[PDB]
UniProtKB/Swiss-Prot annotation:
This is Superkiller complex protein 2. ATP binds at residues 6-13. It is linked to Trichohepatoenteric syndrome 2: A syndrome characterized by intrauterine growth retardation, severe diarrhea in infancy requiring total parenteral nutrition, facial dysmorphism, immunodeficiency, and hair abnormalities, mostly trichorrhexis nodosa. Hepatic involvement contributes to the poor prognosis of affected patients. It comes from Homo sapiens. It is found in: Nucleus; Cytoplasm. Belongs to the helicase family. SKI2 subfamily. Component of the SKI complex which consists of SKIC2, SKIC3 and SKIC8. Interacts with HBS1L isoform 2. The gene is SKIC2. Helicase component of the SKI complex, a multiprotein complex that assists the RNA-degrading exosome during the mRNA decay and quality-control pathways. The SKI complex catalyzes mRNA extraction from 80S ribosomal complexes in the 3'-5' direction and channels mRNA to the cytosolic exosome for degradation. SKI-mediated extraction of mRNA from stalled ribosomes allow binding of the Pelota-HBS1L complex and subsequent ribosome disassembly by ABCE1 for ribosome recycling. In the nucleus, the SKI complex associates with transcriptionally active genes in a manner dependent on PAF1 complex (PAF1C). It comes from the Eukaryota. The chain holds residues 327 to 380 of 1246 of the full protein.
Length: 54
RNA sequence: UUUUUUUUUUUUUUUUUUUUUUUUUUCUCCUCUUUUUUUUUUUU
Protein backbone atom coordinates (compact mmCIF):
# COMPACT_ATOMS: atom_id res chain seq x y z
CA UNK A 1 0.00 0.00 0.00
CA UNK A 2 1.43 3.34 -1.15
CA UNK A 3 0.77 6.93 -0.11
CA UNK A 4 2.13 9.79 -2.24
CA UNK A 5 2.49 13.51 -1.45
CA UNK A 6 4.00 15.50 -4.33
CA UNK A 7 3.30 18.65 -6.35
CA UNK A 8 3.32 17.79 -10.06
CA UNK A 9 0.16 16.14 -11.35
CA UNK A 10 1.36 13.68 -14.00
CA UNK A 11 4.40 12.81 -11.88
CA UNK A 12 2.12 10.91 -9.52
CA UNK A 13 0.40 9.19 -12.46
CA UNK A 14 3.50 7.18 -13.38
CA UNK A 15 2.90 4.65 -10.62
CA UNK A 16 -0.82 4.75 -11.47
CA UNK A 17 -0.21 3.65 -15.04
CA UNK A 18 2.41 1.21 -13.76
CA UNK A 19 -0.37 -0.49 -11.80
CA UNK A 20 -2.69 -0.20 -14.79
CA UNK A 21 -0.19 -1.90 -17.09
CA UNK A 22 0.54 -4.49 -14.39
CA UNK A 23 -3.15 -5.45 -14.22
CA UNK A 24 -3.29 -6.77 -17.80
CA UNK A 25 -0.30 -8.94 -16.98
CA UNK A 26 -2.44 -10.31 -14.14
CA UNK A 27 -5.73 -10.11 -16.13
CA UNK A 28 -7.43 -8.50 -13.12
CA UNK A 29 -9.36 -5.22 -12.98
CA UNK A 30 -8.54 -1.88 -11.40
CA UNK A 31 -10.70 1.07 -10.40
CA UNK A 32 -9.55 4.68 -10.77
CA UNK A 33 -11.62 7.35 -8.98
CA UNK A 34 -11.57 10.98 -10.18
CA UNK A 35 -14.01 13.37 -8.42
CA UNK A 36 -14.40 15.79 -11.33
CA UNK A 37 -15.85 15.32 -14.80
CA UNK A 38 -13.22 17.15 -16.87
CA UNK A 39 -10.28 15.19 -15.45
CA UNK A 40 -12.30 11.95 -15.46
CA UNK A 41 -12.28 11.63 -19.26
CA UNK A 42 -8.81 13.02 -20.03
CA UNK A 43 -7.10 10.00 -18.45
CA UNK A 44 -9.51 7.71 -20.33
CA UNK A 45 -8.54 9.44 -23.58
CA UNK A 46 -4.86 9.22 -22.64
CA UNK A 47 -5.05 5.48 -22.09
CA UNK A 48 -7.44 4.70 -24.96
CA UNK A 49 -5.02 5.23 -27.84
CA UNK A 50 -2.15 4.29 -25.53
CA UNK A 51 -3.28 0.69 -24.97
CA UNK A 52 -6.10 -1.78 -24.46
CA UNK A 53 -9.70 -0.95 -23.60
CA UNK A 54 -10.83 1.54 -20.96
C1' U B 1 -22.03 38.80 -7.03
C1' U B 2 -25.06 31.89 -6.75
C1' U B 3 -19.82 27.00 -8.10
C1' U B 4 -19.14 20.92 -7.96
C1' U B 5 -21.29 15.86 -8.27
C1' U B 6 -25.05 11.95 -7.92
C1' U B 7 -24.08 4.28 -13.67
C1' U B 8 -28.49 1.52 -16.62
C1' U B 9 -34.08 -0.88 -20.57
C1' U B 10 -33.41 -10.35 -17.06
C1' U B 11 -29.18 -13.92 -18.31
C1' U B 12 -30.57 -18.71 -21.32
C1' U B 13 -32.07 -22.24 -25.46
C1' U B 14 -29.49 -27.13 -30.69
C1' U B 15 -36.75 -31.28 -26.06
C1' U B 16 -38.02 -37.96 -26.39
C1' U B 17 -43.15 -39.98 -26.73
C1' U B 18 -44.85 -46.81 -29.99
C1' U B 19 -53.43 -45.18 -30.46
C1' U B 20 -58.90 -45.97 -32.89
C1' U B 21 -66.74 -46.35 -33.82
C1' U B 22 -69.46 -47.61 -29.31
C1' U B 23 -69.57 -47.73 -23.87
C1' U B 24 -74.78 -49.47 -19.12
C1' U B 25 -81.65 -52.51 -17.89
C1' U B 26 -87.73 -52.07 -17.23
C1' C B 27 -92.40 -57.19 -16.33
C1' U B 28 -96.76 -60.46 -17.52
C1' C B 29 -100.44 -58.93 -21.51
C1' C B 30 -109.29 -62.31 -23.30
C1' U B 31 -108.59 -60.28 -31.36
C1' C B 32 -117.05 -61.02 -30.39
C1' U B 33 -120.74 -64.68 -33.73
C1' U B 34 -124.56 -67.48 -41.27
C1' U B 35 -120.92 -71.58 -42.30
C1' U B 36 -118.95 -75.89 -44.39
C1' U B 37 -114.22 -73.26 -46.27
C1' U B 38 -115.97 -71.26 -52.38
C1' U B 39 -113.42 -73.45 -56.70
C1' U B 40 -115.52 -75.95 -63.97
C1' U B 41 -116.57 -72.33 -67.65
C1' U B 42 -115.60 -68.00 -71.30
C1' U B 43 -114.43 -63.20 -72.85
C1' U B 44 -107.69 -59.29 -70.52
Amino acid sequence: SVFVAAHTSAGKTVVAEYAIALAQKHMTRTIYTSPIKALSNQKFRDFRNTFGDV
